[PDB]
Symmetry: C8
């Protein structure tokens, strides 16, 4: 479990080469490669290739004849990239994805069990600022 469950919050920073250093314990979870792709609320997601594979299945589920479905698939998959995790367990984040997630210096990683989200410390703090209560949001599920 220690390293098969993506949980918690990690404060790390964007290196001068645009790389990110996975929290060691996490490195376990992944092999030597991952798929980054753009997330919701400007966050960028990170999955083990296999997991990304499944994440996609959930979509074939969605129509396809629906204009919206096509927009989603395009906004996400045309932006997914496949990145190798280097020896030190770092991951080079693509430029477009960097820009998309407004990544500057100081990142926040959070575990979402399945995947990992990469946030710009500020943008994340803001996101948390709005957002109704956990109880409010849950009531609507």
């Amino acid at each position: 479990f220690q390293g098969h469950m993506l949980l918690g919050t990690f404060n790390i920073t964007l290196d001068a080469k645009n790389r990110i250093s996975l929290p060691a314990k996490l490195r376990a979870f992944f092999e030597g490669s991952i798929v980054i792709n753009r997330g919701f609320e400007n966050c960028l997601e990170v999955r083990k290739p296999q997991d990304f594979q499944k994440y996609f299945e959930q979509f074939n589920s969605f129509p396809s004849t629906q204009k919206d479905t096509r927009t989603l698939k395009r906004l996400i998959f045309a932006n997914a990239n496949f990145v190798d995790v280097d020896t030190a367990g770092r991951v080079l984040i693509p430029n477009n994805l960097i820009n998309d997630a407004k990544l500057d210096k100081e990142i926040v990683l959070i575990g979402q069990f399945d995947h990992l989200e990469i946030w710009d410390k500020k943008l994340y703090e803001d996101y948390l600022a709005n957002s109704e209560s956990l109880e409010t949001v849950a009531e609507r599920m």
Copy 2:
């Protein structure tokens, strides 16, 4: 059963090191590690790692394309922590979680079969104060 079913109410206190002493009988249920994470109504939940694993499944169930789903996952999992239960069967509760559950001195633990909820004695008494009748709440299920 005796230590396979989390039941009852236990009045215990928050130690000077922010640790909590599981009610002995309970210690059985858990191994030497648990996942704490924030609960509903400011309570903080406690599960055996394996159980937490399943609890997460229930979520993949929920959309993901729904803004709300993403808020839930983030408010909960970015706050889950993984804690080792010490020799005396105590558990060190993280600060953020401490603050989140308004844990001061004097805790109330209740069994919810699957998991355990940690409440600030006061906050819990209040919660119980409001809340409609068991019959009222049940009628709506």
Copy 3:
């Protein structure tokens, strides 16, 4: 069947030590332990531990993100207790549960097949007093 089907009505009394004497034939049904927990309409329920185990399953079924679900689970499970049936087949009823079910002297036990309900003779007679006809109540199922 004689003692695997919880049926009928038994008039028994609350002993000076707050114990209850199962109707002998019933003792069969149970082992040497049960789970008491609070029931609906102030009655207190009694199940074989295994059965209680299943009763809980029916709940995971219910949302969890619903405030109501959480209130139910809390009002019931934080009040369940696990009690050993003594040699004479008696069961010591916890104080809180005693107070909750307004148990004084003179109890009424009724079989509900799965479980057993413990009623204060008066409170039960009243309950029966209101309540629409069997036919009325059934029509709405």
Copy 4:
């Protein structure tokens, strides 16, 4: 079949000891014990213990969190009794059940395949008096 399918109408009477004489052919169907319990429209039902066992399953089906469900279960099961059929194939009907079904002298038994209903000749004749046509009632199923 002859004694595996409870069918027809039998006019029998309530003996001075409150016993009822099963129609011989029926005696086959049952062993030496049955479960009586209150029926709908003041009739009292009669099943082989095993069958009663199944009849109950249909109920776990019904909510439980519904006040109505609880009223049904209570009005029926707290009134079921378990009675041994004597050598002559007679069944002693409990007092409460006697009163409940307004059993005086002169009973009417009808087969309902699964179970048997015991009616007070008058009350039954009345019931038949009202009740819309078979065709009317059926149209609504």
Copy 5:
């Protein structure tokens, strides 16, 4: 098929002993016993005991808590009878059923695949008189 499919229309008459003579070819279909029971539109139905057995299943399907369901079951099953087909392939029709189906002299039997319906020649001719077109009735299925 010749005698395993209940089809067609047969004009036969009610004998002085209230017996009916199955159309020979039909006799095949049945053993030496059947279940008569009241049908819809005053017709009286006839099934092989086994088939009647299944016909009943369709009913457990229907609620039971519904007053209507109970009325149906009672109007039909308290009137079913079990009759042995005699050597000449005749069936003695009970009085009540005779009266119920207004059986005088001159009967009309029709095959309904599963079962057989017994009609009073007149009552049947009338029934056919009203009744909308086959096309009308079918459109509503």
Copy 6:
């Protein structure tokens, strides 16, 4: 296939003995017996006994407590007949069915894969005259 799929349109005539001559190729499909029965729009249907057997299943599907269902079953099955196909592959059509389908001289047979429909040349031409477009009718399926 050639004689396993009832297709096309055949113009044949009603013989002086009310017999019909199956189109040779068709004779294959059937054995030496069929079930005729009344069809929709005054057409009379023709199936291999086995197939008719299945066609009936589709009906048990339909309620039975519905007045309409009973009318359908009666209008169709009390009119089905079972006819042997003679050596020359002809089929003697019953009088009632003849009258029902307004069969005079000059018949039109059409294949409906499963079954065969027998039409009076005129009545069929008319039917085709009304009837909305194939596209219209299909849109509503």
Copy 7:
């Protein structure tokens, strides 16, 4: 795949004997026989007999008691024909079907994976002329 997937558009012409020359590559797909039958929008469809067999299944699915269903089945199946593909891979198209699809000289064949549609070059061009956008039509699926 090359010849197991009916795709594309082929411009061919109606021969002086009303035959059509399958595009060679296609000939593979089919054996030496096909079922033609009338299509939607005056096009005439072409399937391998086996495939036509399945296409029909989709219909038993549709009611049958619905007047519309009966109209569809009749408009299509009474017009299906079964045609042998000759040595040169040509198919003789029936007259009625010729007239129905307004086939003159110059045909357009299009692949619809399962089947093949035969269009009169003009009628097809027109069809394409109207018809909303692919995106419009898809949105409604």
Copy 8:
């Protein structure tokens, strides 16, 4: 994965012979043949023949009696083509498809996991220009 998951965005150009050069890494994914066919929003899709095979299944799913379904199938499949990927991994794009996707000079390829979409650099940039936010589009799934 690297060549089993069609991801990313590639800027390539339309050669003087109307051919397109797959991004090398992609060439892996495909054999030596693909099916091009018109996509949504004027893009042209590209699948391995086998995959296209499955994509079609999703359609049999859709009615067929629906005018719209027929329009879709026709607009897409009558335009699919089957193209061999040449030695250098290039693909010759048909004229009609070229015109349909307004392909001039400068193409944009995007991975959609299952398939590949070919866009005219401009038309694609525009498409991206409109289109609501990822979050907006997702909320509606």
